[PDB]
């Protein structure tokens, strides 16, 4: 397997 | 601060790495596991050292340092 690296991260509505 | 990287280690000894901040709720990398598994994220158990990572328990909670290991096993 390769490495993995996961990064975790209104009024313009119209519905 | 700064990211840190947390290595997830699956049953059969795949890994995937996640940087997350000190902050950060631990059930956004459960998720974001079990999609890329493939499976509920209720049909696994994270844990940390043995002890269960709860959805809201965060590194800063966990005593979590840089490259800390997490262990999935099935619920």
Same mark, same amino acid.
Not at chain 2, 11 to 35: C, G, N, P, R
């Given at each position: 397997?390769?490495?993995?690296?996961?990064?975790?991260?209104?009024?313009?509505?119209?519905? | 601060? !700064?990211?840190?990287?947390?290595?997830?280690?699956?049953?059969?000894?795949?890994?995937?790495?996640?940087?997350?901040?000190?902050?950060?709720?631990?059930?956004?990398?459960?998720?974001?596991?079990?999609?890329?598994?493939?499976?509920?994220?209720?049909?696994?158990?994270?844990?940390? !050292?043995?002890?269960?990572?709860?959805?809201?328990?965060?590194?800063?909670?966990?005593?979590?340092?840089? !490259?800390?290991?997490?262990?999935?096993?099935?619920?």
């Amino acid at each position: 397997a390769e490495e993995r690296v996961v990064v975790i991260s209104n009024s313009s509505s119209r519905y | 601060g !700064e990211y840190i990287k947390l290595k997830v280690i699956g049953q059969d000894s795949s890994e995937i790495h996640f940087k997350v901040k000190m902050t950060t709720h631990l059930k956004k990398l459960k998720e974001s596991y079990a999609q890329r598994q493939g499976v509920p994220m209720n049909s696994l158990r994270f844990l940390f !050292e043995g002890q269960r990572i709860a959805d809201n328990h965060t590194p800063k909670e966990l005593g979590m340092e840089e !490259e800390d290991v997490i262990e999935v096993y099935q619920e």
